[PDB]
Design a protein around this nucleic acid. Sequence first.
RNA 1: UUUAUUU
Lengths: 84, 81
Amino acid sequence: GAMGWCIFIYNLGQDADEGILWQMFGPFGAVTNVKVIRDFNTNKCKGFGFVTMTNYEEAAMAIASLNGYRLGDKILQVSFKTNK
Amino acid sequence: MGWCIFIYNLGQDADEGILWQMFGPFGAVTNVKVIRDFNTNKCKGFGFVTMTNYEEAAMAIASLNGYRLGDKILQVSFKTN
RNA sequence: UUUAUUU
């Protein structure tokens, strides 16, 4: 719908930035927003972020390819965002 | 803040209650956490306690290291970087 | 075997 679908990415590095998210997700389809969550005191990435994709089937393709992807030396976890 | 204490060789079913019961008697404790596998939610075998007072943390460590928890011998120490 | 897990 209008909100799109929100994807949660875990196991980003301390120097990860929005550019790394756009680059990873952009290829699978329309991406409308990205955000890296950063540590209040250090300004480093706390290790996770969010990407909003418009179309469910493109979001599902992204998650299938990127969940388990090795970025630097860490195995990413990616899935649709849950509440909290 | 306080002094962070590392506890290794916790079993799968270990929880915060067991850590509170062990370390509580030695002095002020402000946090306990058991580390769990994100998927299975089973304790991965270690946890942490934060105690406020350096000398009380020392006493807990010297007293509890080698403590037998179920079938397992615990390793307790000041947390390393 | 030394805690970033959902803005």
